[PDB]
Amino acid sequence: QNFRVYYRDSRDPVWKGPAKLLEKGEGAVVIQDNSDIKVVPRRKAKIIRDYGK
Amino acid sequence: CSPGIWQLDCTHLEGKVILVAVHVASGYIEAEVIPAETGQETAYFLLKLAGRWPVKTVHTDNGSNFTSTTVKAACWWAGIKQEFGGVIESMNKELKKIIGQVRDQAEHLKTAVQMAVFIHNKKRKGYSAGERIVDIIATDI
Amino acid sequence: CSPGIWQLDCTHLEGKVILVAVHVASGYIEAEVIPAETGQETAYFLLKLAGRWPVKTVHTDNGSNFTSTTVKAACWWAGIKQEFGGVIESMNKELKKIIGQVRDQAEHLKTAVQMAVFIHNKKRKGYSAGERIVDIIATDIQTK
Amino acid sequence: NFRVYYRDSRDPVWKGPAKLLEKGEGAVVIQDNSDIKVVPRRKAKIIRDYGK
Numbered sequence: 001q002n003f004r005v006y007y008r009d010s011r012d013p014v015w016k017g018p019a020k021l022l023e024k025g026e027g028a029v030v031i032q033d034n035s036d037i038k039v040v041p042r043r044k045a046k047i048i049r050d051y052g053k
Numbered sequence: 054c055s056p057g058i059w060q061l062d063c064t065h066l067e068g069k070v071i072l073v074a075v076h077v078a079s080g081y082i083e084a085e086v087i088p089a090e091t092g093q094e095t096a097y098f099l100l101k102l103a104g105r106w107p108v109k110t111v112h113t114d115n116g117s118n119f120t121s122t123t124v125k126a127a128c129w130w131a132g133i134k135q136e137f138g139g140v141i142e143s144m145n146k147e148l149k150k151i152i153g154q155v156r157d158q159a160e161h162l163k164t165a166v167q168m169a170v171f172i173h174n175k176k177r178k179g180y181s182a183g184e185r186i187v188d189i190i191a192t193d194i
Numbered sequence: 195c196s197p198g199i200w201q202l203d204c205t206h207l208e209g210k211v212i213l214v215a216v217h218v219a220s221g222y223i224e225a226e227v228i229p230a231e232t233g234q235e236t237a238y239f240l241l242k243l244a245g246r247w248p249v250k251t252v253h254t255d256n257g258s259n260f261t262s263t264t265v266k267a268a269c270w271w272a273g274i275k276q277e278f279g280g281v282i283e284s285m286n287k288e289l290k291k292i293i294g295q296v297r298d299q300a301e302h303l304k305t306a307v308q309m310a311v312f313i314h315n316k317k318r319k320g321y322s323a324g325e326r327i328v329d330i331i332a333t334d335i336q337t338k
Numbered sequence: 339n340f341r342v343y344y345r346d347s348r349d350p351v352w353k354g355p356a357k358l359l360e361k362g363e364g365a366v367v368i369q370d371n372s373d374i375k376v377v378p379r380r381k382a383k384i385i386r387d388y389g390k
């Protein structure tokens with residue numbers, strides 16, 4: 001049902017998120033974190049759904 | 054008190070970090086000695102806890118491990134609501150008291166922690182905390 | 195099946211040792227990745243399990259971690275009878291299937307293991323295994 | 339009262355259970371099968387009677 005995206009940015013090893021999933025491509029995910037739209041390589045993003053709800 | 058509500062906190066003995074979870078309505082506890090007081094260790098603990106019980110809300114203080122992104126991810130995936138900001142603090146003290154009573158029976162602190170958890174959960178007040186959590190959950194199915 | 199009976203066994207993925215406990219009457223499981231397939235790791239797992247549930251009998255094969263003195267000491271301290279001698283084996287396979295389904299969602303194998311345990315215990319067949327173990331044990335308590 | 343597992347003959351496998359007879363500060367007097375043994379504290383595991 002619903003997805004949130006957690007991701008890593010510019011060198012920063014801290015995970016960021018939740019961000020809104022805008023679009024999923026083969027190599028990148030487009031997300032919105034608060035007020036910034038970001039294009040994130042798939043390998044640096046985890047798209048997590050609210051499985052237990 | 055709702056059957057889905059848990060409090061978690063960390064306490065410390067012998068330089069080691071003990072992560073404790075209490076089921077608020079029963080007093081039932083679970084605890085683990087973790088190697089570092091990090092979000093990733095806390096998130097892993099939460100995933101285990103959520104697979105055993107119907108965890109709906111987890112109340113903690115604002116410790117940086119509890120506000121970490123990996124804990125947010127764990128809670129999101131498991132369906133857990135986080136609330137921030139003294140049942141668990143009384144439990145920490147009680148758990149450390151039992152640990153002290155049994156400590157010289159084991160080499161490892163973690164062994165004494167689990168013996169103390171068992172002693173706490175099995176003691177009848179007259180139901181034990183371990184009986185009460187199962188009674189409360191079952192009746193709420 | 196009696197409410198107190200558990201089966202334990204180790205299984206392996208990615209060179210890691212996964213210790214699995216199944217409550218036979220419900221199908222509920224708990225599992226942990228342990229650093230070595232040893233008696234001391236098995237004894238510590240059992241002490242944790244016994245503090246959560248009313249463990250009366252544990253059934254295992256004859257693997258040397260299950261017949262070790264540390265495990266005998268844990269079982270004596272906690273009041274657990276051991277029996278030696280295919281619920282858990284079927285459960286190992288099911289757990290591995292779910293782990294394989296979710297494995298690419300996590301960096302660490304242990305994370306996938308606990309995700310799989312959750313998926314297994316929360317699935318409604320109409321009760322889930324997590325609901326059944328709690329109902330079975332509560333009924334025992336409430337009627338004594 | 340208590341129960342004792344112990345190591346002695348340069349063997350890392352824990353032995354026991356033995357009967358506890360005395361808990362010294364440095365050593366433990368136990369009986370195992372029919373032998374009286376005196377073991378240093380660090381080679382003994384003295385566990386109070388809990389569980390059953």
Ligand SMILES: Cc1ccc(C2CC2)c(-c2ccc3c(c2C)CCCO3)c1[C@H](OC(C)(C)C)C(=O)O
Nearest residue numbers: 006015046093096122123126127130300301302305
């Ligand atoms: C290593 C790591 C880094 C970041 C993240 C999250 C993106 C912010 C996670 C993580 C945390 C919780 C969780 C899930 C994951 C993917 C998947 C769904 C179930 O809940 C992990 C995770 O490892 C543990 C030890 C659990 C933190 C892993 O193995 O990948």
Ligand SMILES: Cc1ccc(C2CC2)c(-c2ccc3c(c2C)CCCO3)c1[C@H](OC(C)(C)C)C(=O)O
Nearest residue numbers: 159160161164234237263264267268271343352383
């Ligand atoms: C290190 C060690 C070596 C031997 C033993 C037993 C003598 C054969 C134990 C042991 C095993 C089970 C157990 C208890 C102990 C003391 C105490 C009562 C509760 O059940 C331990 C123990 O460590 C774990 C990780 C649990 C194996 C420890 O910390 O001393």
Ligand SMILES: [Cl-]
Nearest residue numbers: 025026027028
């Ligand atoms: Cl793309």
Ligand SMILES: [Mg+2]
Nearest residue numbers: 062063114116
């Ligand atoms: Mg705190």
Ligand SMILES: [Mg+2]
Nearest residue numbers: 203204255257
């Ligand atoms: Mg086996």
